[PDB]
Each structure stands twice: as structure tokens, then as C-alpha cells.
Paper text:
The Endosomal Sorting Complexes Required for Transport (ESCRT) pathway drives multiple cellular membrane fission processes through the formation of filaments comprising different subsets of related ESCRT-III family members. ESCRT-III filaments stabilize highly curved membrane necks that resolve by fission when the filaments are remodeled by Vps4. Vps4 is monomeric or dimeric at cytoplasmic concentrations, but forms a hexamer when active and recruited to ESCRT-III filaments. The Vps4 N-terminal MIT domain is followed by an ~40 residue flexible linker and an ATPase cassette that comprises a large ATPase domain, small ATPase domain, and a β domain.
The six Vps4 subunits form a closed ring, with six Vta1 VSL domains binding around the periphery and a single ESCRT-III peptide bound in the central pore. Subunit E deviates slightly from the more exact helical symmetry of subunits A-D. The large domain of subunit F is disengaged from adjacent Vps4 subunits (and substrate) and appears to be transitioning between the two ends of the Vps4 helix. Subunit F and features at the ring periphery, including the Vps4 β domains and the Vta1 VSL domains, have weak density. The density of subunit F is too weak to reliably assess the presence of nucleotide, and it may be empty. The E small domain to F large domain contacts are mediated by the same hydrophobic contacts, albeit with a rotation of ~25° and attendant shifts of 4.5–7.5 Å. Thus, this interaction appears to be maintained throughout the reaction cycle as subunits transition from the lagging (subunit E) to the leading (subunit A) end of the Vps4 helix, and may help maintain the hexameric assembly while the hydrolysis and release of ATP disrupts the core large domain contacts that define the ESCRT-III substrate-binding site. The specific point in the reaction cycle captured in our structure corresponds to subunit E just starting to transition toward the F state, as indicated by the slight deviation of the DE interface from the configuration of AB, BC, and CD, and consistent with our structural interpretation that ADP is bound to subunit D (above).
Author numbering:
A (entry chain A): 116 to 364, 369 to 433
B (entry chain G): 165 to 172
C (entry chain H), E (entry chain I): 289 to 330
D (entry chain B): 112 to 364, 369 to 437
F (entry chain C): 204 to 307
The structure:
């Protein structure tokens, strides 16, 4: 009981469906597996049953766990973010009751969506594994994911992975919609720059974000989150690196300026009073600076094995 | 308790 | 002097750098010059 | 619970190794990134509000002996944050998923004691690309490190995860993703080598000038900072070799003081160091033939194809540590 | 391209400064020059 | 050792024994059989015994004061470059010469 109920989160990470950029098929499947059974429960009667397993796969850093956070905010479910740390035990016959308890409290808390993140660490083909951990966990989990007709409220089993070809074929069978989350294209990248700059004062236009989105082909959403992180640091570099500020404009306000300018006093940021600093604007040279420094993450043979699995099973 | 050994 | 003249060139060449951080070529072409002339004054 | 905290009580280090940012030579860029990820959030916490968040992972890589662990000691002195230094000896327990329960407890401690720093030295021994590794150690320690670094219900606020490695190409791509600023620590250039000689001689009496250190720094191209620390170690042994091979000493100048001199000289008595009284010895100052002697004897440590794969990784995924 | 030239001018100035830290006037008078000429090339 | 990461708390408490009884000498005879360049070796033995020997010899919180680590080998070119770095005086013991043979 009081050892697996550290799978329920309760803080609701505030990501809404208009923060993931693109991925419309994936939002479509997730809406018609999560939102629609609750909102119109009269429809699912007779032969029409809801989906009971969804695998998200892709290259590293493209949106899988983040989209799971979006489900965790928008679902109005009870959400178990369980993992391999919370199921395996020393004592034999504990990695039977732990899975069994998990699904029984999921049926205490219907509707339930359960997010077994990185399923390849529980389920490892059982030809080399140890007795306790590998066999009784994977067999009990196969049984309890064979609840087809009884699980009409409650368990929707998500799951994300980066190595979808190292997954056991019985568990490839249980996940009945293997969706592929790819590296993002042009409109999505432009959307991610517009989101990640937030409400920060910038001189940029739509053609500027359009320019950067044209510039960054090959980047995942992590990389664009860190080029926006670094480019937002660029003003504090233009305040630390300072020999000369200047007043502009609610009582005194000074910003960095070149040596010898209209009201150019010589000082350091340290010399200047709390608040009464005028944080420099965001240019496009800040983003070009960041994009020169930051270098992509995925390697273009990882994509060959991802496309392999998509063409064979996905 | 079921301890792990390690093989070659 | 000198031990200082050598120190003021750097002071200049810094301002010059700091200036190009606003693309201010004017200031730059000047400080990077007041500096050079002075390294010849050495 | 308390058994496990009894194990990990011996990781919160408590001695502050006194390396300061000037004891590091070279490396403008790596000190710059480390300062704006460690020092600056604590000193001005009002700035980091809104979209402006601090960095939460930094990987340092390079050839052997160039400054990585030393720069981590500099952070450990200057940070004013709790500095956990963990390693593979302290995570692999014997007992069916303690090597996940220990990791989870590690970051739980580093969230209850925020702001914290976790320095995983030689991360390439935990995280080995998972295509050939074994089930437990591989999938379960790597997987709990992944999920624990960003995950879903985990909140990596205010923790920083450093990490150093010598084989940065044998690192799993999910963990290459988690370390979001891969900085490269290279072999030193001319000004850095000259700085390291000037530092490592310390306050030892030497006849050397700026052009002498400049000469040695010109002489040593290819050496890392370890090698220059040991040529200064060996060259500082050279006065003892003089003062043992000295048939004959001589008084010079606070009451009696004798130094080795050639057979037959101005006041050349014949004796051995053993014959001479406590303190009242005068040892020949570091004179440039001692350093030339040491540099002839000591030979580089890094070869020149290791550098090709380092430059490979820097050109494919990395920053430049300058 | 102009941004690249400006970066190079600033680099040369930084290298010049670093040089005067050994009183090396030769290097200095040169880098502080290769730099200036280039700010006119802008 | 046999039981999963016992083969490096041995390394750690070896060097902690030598720190409790300093000035100590540690003589690792034939070191090329522990330390094998880690590009082909197995996970546990290779990365974990070699890695704990590295971190334990100089490391961060470790203080190699007053301990000395000897070591002999016949294949000195099959030694990992980090451990070639840790051994800071690689001395070469050659085949004898005339005065030595007469002495023997
Ligand atoms: N579709 C997206 N919309 C917004 N941000 C995204 C998106 N994809 C990635 N990101 C950024 O990348 C971060 C990493 O996402 P994450 O969940 O770790 O990806 P994944 O689990 O596939 O590796 C996200 O939290 C966000 O910072
Ligand atoms: N860049 C450097 N500046 C100053 N000392 C250095 C530098 N690099 C190395 N050293 C010296 O060489 C030793 C090796 O440094 P260390 O941190 O162990 O290197 P690393 O962990 O990369 O191999 C340090 O203890 C220090 O004594
Ligand atoms: F796609 Be992520 F790296 F989980
Ligand atoms: F940490 Be060092 F570069 F061996
Ligand atoms: Mg993820
Ligand atoms: Mg080190």
C-alpha cells in the first residue's frame, strides 16, 4: 500500500495542449483515448471499446515525456508515474504483489492512466536475466495487461521509449498503437521559439522567428529550449561585461552602452543600485550567437534504426 | 533475501 | 609613466572592444588608434 | 531509510579543497560557464525569474590531465553549495535494486539540501551506450539516472549535475542529451603553460626571469597540466641531488651557513651533508639548468590520435573551452 | 560577414592586450594594427 | 570478487587501510591485468575496478598524502593512458651489462 502510493503525483505540471508544437496525430489519438470516454460515456457500449495501450516512441528529446505531462495536466484522471525503481524487490514474491497491487489501486481510482516510462528496463527478453526480477514481473504484467473486456474504465497504459527495437514481441503486441514522435519541421520550430521566449521584451518580428526556424533544421525541442535559454542569458553577459552605462526614460534607469556616448558614465553593474538597472533588449544576434555555439544532439544513424522499426511494426 | 551474483 | 602608458593602451583597446559590442565603429576606430599611436610613443 | 542515510553520510564532503579560480590556469570559457551556472544564481537570485532558468547539467571532457577534476575542486571551494561527490563504488549495491533505490535517495537528499551540486566523476563507467551491457546494471542504473534527471514527477530545480570523462564518444545518447553544455577542456597553449610554471614554482627561491618561464613554455608543446606539475616536482628535487653529491661545502653570508662547492674553493672544507648542522645548510637556488635537466628527463603523456577522436566529438557535439 | 569581421577585430585586440602583459611591444603593435586595418575594411 | 560491486569496495578499503597506517606502500604486482584500456572490456570488472583505482589514486576528496603505489609490468604499452598518467615516474629495468653480471 504505503510503498507504491508514491506513484501518484499531485502537483499537476502546468503544460497545456497548446504548448506542444505540432504532433497533431498524437494529440488526436490521445484525445480520443483519454478525453472522449469520460466526456461521452454513452458512446462506448456494445462492440465499441476504448483503447487499452499506447506506445510512444522516437529519437531522444522529441516530446514523449512532455506530452505525457500534458496528459497529466489535462486528463482529470488519477495518474501513476510508476517505474522500475518502485516495482522490484529483494524478497521473492514481492515483485508479484507489487504489480498486482498497482493495478488494484488503479481500479480503486477509476479513471486511471498509468505511465510506465521506459518499459525496456522492466521487460528484457528473458534469455539472460535473473530469476526473480525478470521472470515473475514480466509474466504477471502480461497477465494483468490481458484485461481486455473488464478494463473499460481505468487503465490506459501509456509508455515511452528510445530503443523501440529492444522490446519483447509480446509487449509489442500489448501496446496496440505504436505512434512515432519525430524531429520537428518548420512550423513547429517557429512555434517553439515563439513559445520559449515567453513574455520577454524582444525586438523580433514574425520573419525573425521564421528566419531562425529556417536556420535550425535537425534540432529537437530540447535543443531549441536550450538555445532560447542561452540567448536569454546574453543580456547578463552584456551587463557583466560593462565599462560604461547610461540613463534613459519612474526615477533613474541605466543600461550598458559603448565607451563615449550620450550620458555615458563609466562604471560596473556592481556600482549600480538595486532594480534601477535597465536590462538590455533581445536582438537577433543573440540567437545567432547561441545557434553558432550550440550543436545538435541526434546522430543520423539512430534515425535509420527508428525508421526501420516504423517500417516493420509502427 | 535473493542476492545477485555475477558470471563470466 | 610607461609602466602606465603600457597600461593605458590596454585600457583603450578594451573600450574599443566594448564599443564594437554595439557595432559603434566610430569610437572603435578612434580608441584602437589613440592606443596604437601611444604604443609608438613608447 | 536510516541504514541508507548511514551509508551516504560519507559523501557530503566537509573539507573544502583550497583551489581558487586563479589556481586554475587557462580556460576562460569553462570558468565562465561554471560561474554563471554555480556562483551567479546564489549571489543574485532575483534575476532568475520567468523564462530565465539556470543551467542543470554540464559535462567536461578532454584528454587526460588537463584540468577537469581540478576545476571541479575550484567549484567545490567557491560555490557555497553542498557538494556531493559520488562514484560507482557508492551506487552499485549487492541487493536487487538498491542501485536504483540508492540513486533515487541521492537526488532526494540533494533536493532537501538545495542548492546542491552532484559531481559524478568518470560518468562513462555508469553510462555505456546500452547495446552490449547486462540487464540489471545497464538498464536499471542507466534508466534510473535518466528518469531521475528530468522525468515526470521529479523537479530538477536547483540541483546541478557535473560530470567529467575521457571517453566522451562512448556515452549513451540519452545521457548526451541530459548534459546540456558539453564543454571541452584542451591541452594548454603557450600562455597557459607559462602560467602553470609560474604557479607551480610557488614561492620557491629561483633565479628565473619572465623570459625563462617564457622559454620553458615555448619548450613544452604537447604537455598537459599534469606533466608540467611533475616536471616542476622533479626540478624542485634538483637542489637535494646537489646537496648530497657535495664532497666539500663552504660558508657564505644569522650564524654559520654552508652550501655545496667544487673541490678546492674559497673556504672549501671537505665534508658530507650528514656532517652539517640542522638548518645551517644553504641549498643552491633553482637555476635554469635544473629545469632543463627535468625537461630532458620527463616525456609527454598524451599521444596524438586520442586528440583526433576528441576533436571529432567536439566538432560533432561540443563547445570549445578556449 | 561583417559580424564575423568585428569578432576578428575584437579577438586581435584581446590578443594584443594579452601580449602587453609580457611587454611584447612587437606582437602588440602588429595585432593592434592587423585589427585597425580590418575595421577600415568594414 | 563474485557478488556484484564487491570488487571495488575492496579497492576503496584497500586504499583506506593505507591511509589509516601511513606512511604506507602499495605494491600492485603486474598492473596490466587490472587496467586494460577500457575499449573492449566488460562492464563490471573493467569499468568499475579500473575506475575505482583511478578515482582512488588522485580523485577529488581523496588525499594521496604519504602513500606510494608501486607497480610492475611486462606489457607497458597495453596500459590505459589515465593510469599511465597516474604513475608519474615510469622507470625502465633493462637486461644487464658487464659490471652487473660480474657482480651477480
Ligand atoms: N513539442 C514540444 N513542445 C514544447 N517543448 C518541447 C517539445 N518537445 C520538446 N520540448 C522541449 O524539450 C524538453 C524535453 O522534452 P522531454 O519530455 O524531455 O522530451 P522526451 O521525453 O522525448 O525526451 C521539453 O520539456 C521542452 O523543454
Ligand atoms: N589547467 C591546469 N591548471 C593548473 N594546474 C593544473 C591544470 N591541469 C592540471 N593541473 C595540475 O595537474 C593535476 C592534474 O589535474 P587533475 O584535476 O587531476 O586533472 P584531471 O582530473 O583532468 O585528469 C592537478 O592536480 C594540478 O595539480
Ligand atoms: F525522448 Be526523450 F529523451 F525521453
Ligand atoms: F581527470 Be583527468 F583528465 F585524468
Ligand atoms: Mg523522456
Ligand atoms: Mg580527474
Amino acid at each position: 500500500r504505503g510503498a507504491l502510493s508514491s506513484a501518484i503525483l499531485s502537483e499537476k505540471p502546468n503544460v497545456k495542449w497548446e504548448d506542444v508544437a505540432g504532433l497533431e496525430g498524437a494529440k488526436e489519438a490521445l484525445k480520443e483515448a483519454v478525453i472522449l470516454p469520460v466526456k461521452f460515456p454513452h458512446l462506448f457500449k456494445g462492440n465499441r471499446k476504448p483503447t487499452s495501450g499506447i506506445l510512444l516512441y522516437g529519437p531522444p528529446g522529441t516530446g514523449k515525456s512532455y506530452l505525457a505531462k500534458a496528459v497529466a495536466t489535462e486528463a482529470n484522471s488519477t495518474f501513476f508515474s510508476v517505474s522500475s525503481s518502485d516495482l522490484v524487490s529483494k524478497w521473492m514474491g514481492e515483485s508479484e504483489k507489487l504489480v498486482k497491487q498497482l493495478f488494484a489501486m488503479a481500479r480503486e481510482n477509476k479513471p486511471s492512466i498509468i505511465f510506465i516510462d521506459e518499459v525496456d528496463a522492466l521487460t528484457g527478453t528473458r534469455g539472460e536475466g535473473e530469476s526473480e526480477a525478470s521472470r515473475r514481473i514480466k509474466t504477471e504484467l502480461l497477465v494483468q495487461m490481458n484485461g481486455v473486456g473488464n478494463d473499460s474504465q481505468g487503465v490506459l497504459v501509456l509508455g515511452a521509449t528510445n530503443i523501440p527495437w529492444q522490446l519483447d514481441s509480446a509487449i509489442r503486441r500489448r501496446f496496440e498503437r505504436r505512434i512515432y514522435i519525430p524531429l520537428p519541421d518548420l512550423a513547429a520550430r517557429t512555434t517553439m521559439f515563439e513559445i520559449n521566449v515567453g513574455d520577454t521584451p524582444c525586438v523580433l518580428t514574425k520573419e525573425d522567428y521564421r528566419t531562425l526556424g529556417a536556420m535550425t533544421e535537425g534540432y529537437s525541442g530540447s535543443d531549441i529550449a536550450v538555445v532560447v535559454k542561452d540567448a536569454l542569458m546574453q543580456p547578463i553577459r552584456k551587463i557583466q561585461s560593462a565599462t560604461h552605462f547610461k540613463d534613459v526614460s519612474e526615477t533613474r534607469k541605466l543600461t550598458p552602452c559603448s565607451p563615449g556616448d550620450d550620458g555615458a558614465i563609466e562604471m560596473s553593474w556592481t556600482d549600480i543600485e538595486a532594480d534601477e538597472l535597465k536590462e538590455p533588449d533581445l536582438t537577433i544576434k543573440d540567437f545567432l550567437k547561441a545557434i553558432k555555439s550550440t550543436r545538435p544532439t541526434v546522430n543520423e544513424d539512430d534515425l535509420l534504426k527508428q525508421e526501420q522499426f516504423t517500417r516493420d511494426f509502427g | 533475501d535473493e542476492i545477485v551474483n555475477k558470471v563470466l | 609613466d610607461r609602466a602606465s602608458k603600457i597600461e593605458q593602451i590596454q585600457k583603450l583597446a578594451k573600450y574599443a572592444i566594448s564599443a564594437l559590442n554595439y557595432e559603434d565603429l566610430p569610437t572603435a576606430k578612434d580608441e584602437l588608434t589613440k592606443a596604437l599611436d601611444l604604443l609608438n610613443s613608447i
